[PDB]
Amino acid sequence: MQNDAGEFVDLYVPRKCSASNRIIGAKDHASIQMNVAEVDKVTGRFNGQFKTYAICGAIRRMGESDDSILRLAKADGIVSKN
């Protein structure tokens, strides 16, 4: 992606799955980019900001997209620990 001169020569940088760290292909139409709303610590209202998790279609098909999103939310404090 970087030549010896240091200039970037890639067409684009593809997304990587937030669970498997695998590249999501340009024609992977089963992949998702879910936004999870962030909430105020004392009011519990939408902050206008969110957190994004990209799950590829292979994880969705095998059914571990739910567990992957749950673990990503748990490891981020959106979902309460234990």
Binding site: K16, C17, S20, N21, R22, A58, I59, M62, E64
Partner: protein, 129 residues
């Protein structure tokens, strides 16, 4: 029977990476397995691993960063000279930019780039990319 425990370890790591798992349990452990894993981890492919000590032959739980495409063994361990190393890299590696051949040399177990740095040929153990 089970021969070449390194082949089993590398096949288990490859299969667990294909399945998208975060950890793989390898058994039995061995010195060569630990050295191969250390060479893998120095290059950022595999991450930290823990050696479980049962009193007969250890097991290793290896964390898996999703960076690994394929890890394989070469059987038999052909003796490789420094002049035949380039042919092995062309046969085994996806490109000249990334990918490593792990040799076992009298200077230790290391990748082909280090083996050329230390001016040592050896016996081919495997590869990873």
């Amino acid at each position: 029977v089970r021969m070449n425990v390194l082949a089993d370890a590398l096949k288990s790591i490859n299969n667990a990476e294909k399945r998208g798992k975060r950890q793989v349990l390898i058994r039995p452990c061995s010195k060569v397995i630990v050295r191969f894993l250390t060479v893998m981890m120095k290059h950022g492919y595999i991450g930290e691993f823990e050696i479980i000590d049962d009193h007969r032959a250890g097991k290793i739980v290896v964390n898996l960063t999703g960076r690994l495409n394929k890890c394989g063994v070469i059987s038999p361990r052909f003796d490789v000279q420094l002049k035949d190393l380039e042919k092995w890299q062309n046969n085994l590696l996806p490109s000249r930019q990334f990918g490593f051949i792990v040799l076992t040399t009298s200077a230790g177990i290391m990748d082909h780039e280090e083996a050329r740095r230390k001016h040592t040929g050896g016996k081919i153990l495997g590869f990873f990319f």
